[PDB]
């Protein structure tokens, strides 16, 4: 047998190991939402902090890969940090080999290629962490992409990952089907209300951490407590 | 279990408890270390008369002052004996003197388990500054100094007989006859010169074949 134990093709014609890793992303108890807007792209994920002995300063799941690209990680934290380190290394190596900064789509493609190498062979195993990376790209506007443990890198406008990712994707599909572009107030509010409807806790402005990349202002802004509180007050008005 | 490296659940890894019991399939060999020297007696156990007796050899001289008797897979014993010769020659070349039999046995034991472990037991015997010496090396990379050792299919019975027929102040003349009578008791056929090989160790002589069919002077007394 060992069809479901190693990274080999099943007799039915499937690959069960990556199918298990995708559910491993669901394992861990977390969700994230990515929304692309008219000019910006925002990502928000809940900050599940058990007990205050932890440092809320460093419990984050979102990081700066480069000066303009920011990721959010969903799944096991160790594999998440390993893939974040790999993405930072890839961005730096691209900037060294090619003068211009690495496009977010190319970075997602490289990470997905690494993950596809992982699902190839049998000595190693795929990393159970799904990464959603955003960044402003010239002649393209805001750009959002998702790289999965299989190696399929895609996703745009509104995309979510986590335990209750299906409900968030459904609500975001309803929102994007409603034909109206989101400015840099509506995109953030849409993401916040999506994640709030997914998990109804009213989202006290301490349990989420939102990352924003706009066009007029580049860079991955990890908005502070004041900014998220102001956005929450504006939304709940 | 079955893994050559995995330890047993009780006390000691397997597949080497299997390698050590390869002298059981091997033929009997007995060596006596006396003050006069070291007597190495083995059986050739020729299966057919057409095979040349000189071809079947279980005692090979590692050097002029070291003799070795094998018991087990002759194929593996060839490699071990070749490594022993190479180590002895390297030591002599480096230090311009005769390598001690204990050191040779130590080197061969080091090379014994480093590849599936070798399944042969060796009876090294030679002269040194510490008189004549004999060492029993076993497939599990272990060597022990011994005065009168038996090895082979019936190592138990031969060793038990040697335990009571040996005394601490014997000579070569008594040692050879004791080894030959024991051998005749262990084996199935008689101790014909074409079937029994004998090796002698002397402080002032190199270790040569035992008189090459003129050794009947020792088996007629038997």
């Amino acid at each position: 047998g060992f069809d479901r134990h190693i990274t080999i093709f099943s007799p039915e014609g499937r690959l069960y190991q990556v199918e298990y890793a995708f559910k491993a992303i669901n394992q861990g108890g977390l969700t994230s939402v990515a929304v692309r807007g008219k000019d910006c792209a925002v990502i928000v994920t809940q900050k599940k902090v058990p007990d205050k002995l932890l440092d809320s300063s460093t419990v984050t799941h979102l990081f700066k890969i480069t000066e303009n690209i920011g990721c959010v990680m969903t799944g096991m934290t160790a594999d998440s940090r390993s893939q974040v380190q790999r993405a930072r290394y890839e961005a730096a190596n691209w900037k060294y080999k090619y003068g211009y900064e690495i496009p977010v789509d190319m970075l997602c493609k490289r990470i997905a290629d690494i993950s596809q190498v992982y699902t190839q062979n049998a000595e190693m195993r795929p990393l159970g962490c799904c990464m959603i990376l955003i960044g402003i790209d010239e002649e393209q506007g805001p750009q959002v992409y998702k790289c999965d443990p299989a190696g399929y890198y895609c996703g745009f406008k509104a995309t979510a990952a986590g335990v209750k990712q299906t409900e968030s994707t459904s609500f975001l599909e309803k929102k994007v089907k409603k034909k109206f572009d989101w400015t840099f107030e509506q995109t953030v509010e849409t993401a916040i209300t999506c994640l709030s409807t997914v998990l109804s806790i009213d989202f006290k402005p301490s349990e989420i951490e939102v990352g924003v990349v706009t066009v007029e202002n580049p860079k991955f802004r990890i908005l502070t407590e004041a900014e998220i509180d102001a956005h929450l007050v504006a939304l709940a008005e | 279990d079955r893994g050559v490296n995995t330890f047993s659940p009780e006390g000691r890894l397997f597949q080497v408890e299997y390698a050590i019991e390869a002298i059981k399939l091997g033929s009997t060999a007995i060596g006596i270390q006396t003050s006069e020297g070291v007597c190495l007696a083995v059986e050739k156990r020729i299966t057919s008369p057409l095979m040349e007796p000189s071809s079947i050899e279980k005692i090979v001289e590692i050097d002029a002052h070291i003799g070795c008797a094998m018991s087990g897979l002759i194929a593996d014993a060839k490699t071990l004996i070749d490594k022993a010769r190479v180590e002895t020659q390297n030591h002599w070349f480096t230090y311009n003197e005769t390598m001690t039999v204990e050191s040779v046995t130590q080197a061969v034991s080091n090379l014994a388990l480093q590849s599936r472990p070798f399944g042969v037991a060796l009876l090294f015997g030679g002269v040194d500054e510490k008189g004549p010496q004999l060492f029993h090396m076993d497939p599990s990379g272990t060597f022990v100094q011994c005065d009168a050792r038996a090895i082979g299919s019936a190592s138990e019975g031969a060793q038990s007989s040697l335990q009571e027929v040996y005394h601490k102040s014997m000579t070569l003349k008594e040692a050879i006859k004791s080894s030959l009578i024991i051998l005749k008791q262990v084996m199935e056929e008689k101790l014909n010169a074409t079937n029994i090989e004998l090796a002698t160790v002397q402080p002032g002589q190199n270790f040569h074949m035992f008189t090459k069919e003129e050794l009947e002077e020792v088996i007629k007394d038997i």
């Binding site: 290629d113 190498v117 745009f156 | -």
Partner: protein
């Protein structure tokens, strides 16, 4: 062990499972016309959240070599990257032949690192190759384990059987002009469930002038009046 493996008596069980996997569900039809070759596939993205101009199913390996594929897209990315590297290496070794159709057979042959060195797990994608730098077009298929087949019209989707039946009944034929892409779209229509649109259908064409992935404008234009 570390290569293409698992071959019992008279069988290639692992290869057969790979072929069951590449059955997929993306038709990705290919038609070799007199003027050129058309590789048309279906991009049926889940919901409208995904994008169609972000990822592509048809990839130009070189100037006039286009590529379409089947199930296991992540494997297909690595395979097309390897094919691009191999074609570039051939063009660098044999400098300036404008190698497309005298290379299409060669690049298909060098698709032996594709499967003959499987990499423990064999690739789960079958790919169709088009090239027209010989005065004549070429359509080749490489499967998860075999080699070049030199097709004239075929499909590699969930309904590839009935797709191929439609191709032969509709007479892929030999006198057909470059605009056999209409027949390719019709063949996709048989293996399509929905109102196919410009972003839903991606097609690349390779004629004697070169290869070009048709933009949604021309895809919608062809889809009009169907």
């Amino acid at each position: 062990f570390s290569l293409t493996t698992f071959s019992p008596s008279g069988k290639l069980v692992q290869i057969e499972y790979a072929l069951a996997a590449v059955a997929g569900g993306a038709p990705s039809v290919g038609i070799k016309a007199a003027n050129g070759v058309v590789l048309a596939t279906e991009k049926k993205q889940k919901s409208i959240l995904y994008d169609e101009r972000s990822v592509h199913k048809v990839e130009p390996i070189t100037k006039h070599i286009g590529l379409v594929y089947s199930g296991m897209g992540p494997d297909y990315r690595v395979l097309v990257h390897r094919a691009r590297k191999l074609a570039q290496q051939y063009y660098l070794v044999y400098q300036e032949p404008i190698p497309t159709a005298q290379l299409v057979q060669r690049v298909a042959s060098v698709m032996q690192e594709y499967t003959q060195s499987g990499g423990v797990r064999p690739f789960g994608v079958s790919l169709l190759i088009c090239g027209w730098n010989e005065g004549r077009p070429y359509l080749f298929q490489s499967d998860p384990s075999g080699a070049y087949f030199a097709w004239k019209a075929t499909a590699m989707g969930k309904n590839y059987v009935n797709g191929k039946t439609f191709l032969e009944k509709r007479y892929n034929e030999d006198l057909e002009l470059e605009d056999a892409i209409h027949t390719a779209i019709l063949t996709l229509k048989e293996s399509f469930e929905g109102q196919m649109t410009e972003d839903n259908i991606e097609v690349g064409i390779c004629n004697e002038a070169g290869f070009r992935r048709l933009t949604p404008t021309e895809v919608k234009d062809y889809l009009a009046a169907i």
